């Protein structure tokens, strides 16, 4: 290989691997924040569906 080719190929490798490393660090920080706060699309543990509630008039009024 030419030194130019190896040099610029090394630069492409370094850019790809540095971008992957920054995305892994951001992924760790995102997972930490979403587990702590629960406001993201991850760590959404189920609650009861409110569509199961009967909203009809019952046999007694006070409900």
């Amino acid at each position: 290989d030419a030194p130019e080719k190896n040099y610029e190929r090394t630069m492409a490798i370094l850019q790809i691997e540095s971008e992957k490393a920054e995305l892994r660090l951001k992924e760790l920080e995102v997972r930490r924040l979403m587990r702590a706060k629960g406001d993201g699309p991850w760590f959404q543990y189920p609650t009861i569906d409110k569509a199961l509630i009967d909203h009809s008039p019952k046999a007694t009024p006070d409900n």
């Binding site: 040099y7 370094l14 850019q15």
Partner: protein, 171 residues
């Protein structure tokens, strides 16, 4: 040949032969025999090979690296800039190694050439050797096997803090 400024030599002063005896020395006869039997056939073979070179002349080049930004003006953990700075630093370190080698070759050539009066007559080469070894030592010594431009910059900043503190305490 080479450049006579990077590899300097003083002018050669050989004395004229002043024979006092009547005995012929064998060295002149052996010099004539070496000129006839050895030097002329070697010269003719080299002239043949040199004509064969001159029939097909072609060239090679000394590779010129332009200056890229060094490690001081690279942002921290920016691998695309500090890669190029690190490669530039490694090339400059290899060239500084060869500069020290050139000055050592000058020192050794002066010591052989001046002979038994080498200590007086090689003070300039010794002084240039001391200056370039001090500069090389301040620049690259104690960096370790895992040297980089960052290690060298940290060493320089430590040395500059020591020099600034010594200047401040002496005033």
């Amino acid at each position: 040949s080479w450049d006579k400024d990077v590899y300097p030599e003083p002018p050669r002063r050989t004395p004229a032969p002043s024979p006092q005896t009547s005995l012929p020395n064998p060295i002149t006869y052996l010099t004539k025999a070496f000129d006839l039997l050895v030097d002329r056939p070697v010269t003719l073979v080299r002239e043949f090979i040199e004509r064969q070179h001159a029939k097909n002349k072609y060239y090679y080049y000394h590779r010129e690296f332009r200056r890229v930004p060094d490690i001081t003006e690279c942002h921290e953990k920016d691998v695309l800039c500090m890669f190029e700075a690190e490669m530039q630093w490694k090339r400059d370190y290899k060239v500084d190694q060869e500069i020290v080698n050139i000055i050592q070759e000058r020192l050794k050539a002066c010591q052989q050439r001046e002979g038994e009066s080498h200590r007086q007559n090689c003070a300039k080469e010794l002084q240039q050797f001391t200056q370039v070894v001090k500069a090389y030592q301040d620049r690259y010594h104690d960096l370790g096997a895992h040297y980089s431009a960052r290690k060298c910059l940290a060493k320089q900043k430590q040395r500059m803090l020591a020099e600034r503190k010594a200047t401040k305490e002496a005033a």
